[PDB]
Amino acid sequence: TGRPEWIWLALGTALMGLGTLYFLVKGMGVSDPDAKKFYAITTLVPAIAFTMYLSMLLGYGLTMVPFGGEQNPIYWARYADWLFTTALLLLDLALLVDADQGTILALVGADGIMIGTGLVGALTKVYSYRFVWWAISTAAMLYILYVLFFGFTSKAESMRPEVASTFKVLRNVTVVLWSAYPVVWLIGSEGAGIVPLNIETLLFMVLDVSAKVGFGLILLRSRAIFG
Numbered sequence: 001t002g003r004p005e006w007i008w009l010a011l012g013t014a015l016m017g018l019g020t021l022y023f024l025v026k027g028m029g030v031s032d033p034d035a036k037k038f039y040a041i042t043t044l045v046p047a048i049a050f051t052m053y054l055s056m057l058l059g060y061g062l063t064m065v066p067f068g069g070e071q072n073p074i075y076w077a078r079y080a081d082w083l084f085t086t087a088l089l090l091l092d093l094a095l096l097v098d099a100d101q102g103t104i105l106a107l108v109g110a111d112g113i114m115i116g117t118g119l120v121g122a123l124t125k126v127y128s129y130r131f132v133w134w135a136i137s138t139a140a141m142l143y144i145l146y147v148l149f150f151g152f153t154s155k156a157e158s159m160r161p162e163v164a165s166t167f168k169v170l171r172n173v174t175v176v177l178w179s180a181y182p183v184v185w186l187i188g189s190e191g192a193g194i195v196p197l198n199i200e201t202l203l204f205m206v207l208d209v210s211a212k213v214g215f216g217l218i219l220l221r222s223r224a225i226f227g
């Protein structure tokens, strides 16, 4: 096929793969129990991303959805990735501030809605309706970020500054990166079709890589992960 975005898919596969191996290697040398539990969660994130980027690179996860009078190329393998990666990231942050089970359950549940309605909207054939679903998915995300900002930041205050400081950074990187996804979707292939797929893939690989390997590097190199 040789689609114009393939280069970005290969670069995302490459980065996720390398990020996975370094986390894996670093994680299996650690003896601390708690450290092992962030290391296992954080390594799995780029591992899943790698498989999905690889599949997309190889021609899967792509579907032609009709709307706007066009046959639009929608990469659905992305949500198969994010459904597990976003929730895992959320768990990492939750375990960091000692978030309560109810919180974790509610956060992960909201996250399922976000990704679920997101895909439904990326698959919807009525143009305007695609934006109705997108709207509900973004609302779900804003709920998630509100909790991370108001809830979590508050509980990280019962933590040592080292843990409170690591969380702030991960929280900040998360709020900034996640905020970007809905806008990429809106102006790109799933939405207005303003930004082309090849450029859109580039924007998504940058956010994905940053949000996973960027996030993991920061978290795994911190002492806040120790029991």
Ligand SMILES: *C/C=C(C)/C=C/C=C(C)/C=C/C1=C(C)CCCC1(C)C
Binding pocket: 049, 082, 085, 086, 089, 114, 115, 118, 119, 134, 137, 138, 139, 141, 177, 178, 179, 181, 182, 185, 208, 211, 212
């Ligand atoms: C590794 C992947 C990460 C951290 C992905 C984060 C993805 C989001 C915050 C996605 C959000 C979306 C919306 C708010 C609405 C429309 C569709 C999505 C799924 C792109």
